[PDB]
């Protein structure tokens, strides 16, 4: 409901904007796609783009320690919940040896997570999000989906 911690989903349930959204971080050998994907009605695409870009730049500029430690706890739970089970453990082992060349233990993952704090989060988010040219893929009734110029103009702020 409206009591969700994440501001984007709270705004979505308050305004009945979207049917769904997700954040993804797909990685390949020294490259990747970091972003979001949402399913929404044709009359709310501009609002979801505006609110998602606002949340991205809020993390870029004024991300706070409370949501940083909330995201840290969510990431710890996500990593352990994924690595619970023989099939995902074997998948992690094979993928880790193919990509990293070694199997990173959960202790090392937790050490990196504890290394992440608010200033580091806003610095890395400003490096990878702020004033960057995005890739947009729209499918369906996407007439209200803004053009690339408006999407990029949302991908910066005039007040930092």
């Amino acid at each position: 409901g409206v009591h969700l911690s994440s501001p984007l989903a709270s705004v979505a349930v308050a305004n009945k904007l979207c049917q769904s959204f997700q954040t993804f971080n797909i990685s390949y050998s020294d490259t990747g796609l970091l972003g979001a994907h949402f399913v929404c009605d044709a009359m709310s695409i501009d609002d979801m783009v505006f609110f998602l870009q606002g949340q991205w730049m809020r993390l870029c500029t004024s991300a706070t320690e409370s949501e940083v430690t909330r995201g840290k706890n969510i990431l710890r739970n996500a990593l352990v919940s994924h690595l619970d089970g023989t099939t995902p453990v074997c998948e992690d082992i094979g993928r880790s040896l193919l990509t990293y060349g070694r199997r990173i233990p959960l202790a090392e993952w937790e050490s990196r997570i504890q290394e992440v704090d608010a200033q580091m989060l806003r610095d890395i988010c400003s490096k990878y999000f702020y004033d960057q040219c995005p890739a947009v893929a729209g499918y369906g009734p996407i007439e209200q989906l803004p053009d690339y110029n408006r999407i990029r103009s949302g991908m910066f702020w005039l007040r930092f």
Partner: protein
Amino acid sequence: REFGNLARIRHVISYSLSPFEQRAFPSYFSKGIPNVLRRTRERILRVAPPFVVVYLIYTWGNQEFEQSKRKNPAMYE
């Protein structure tokens, strides 16, 4: 009225790049000059004959006005 319910478009795919990744003036002269020449050739025969007959009427009117202000040599006496 607004975006979303303007038209009915199906099965149309649009491709665009970043302004920060593509050139602002991609072959500005080597393709701009033939395009301007083609547009001029396409729309030159609809404007130039009226403007030339304006020029002809202007010169004719000025000339015959000067000739009307000229003295007729019939009145020697």
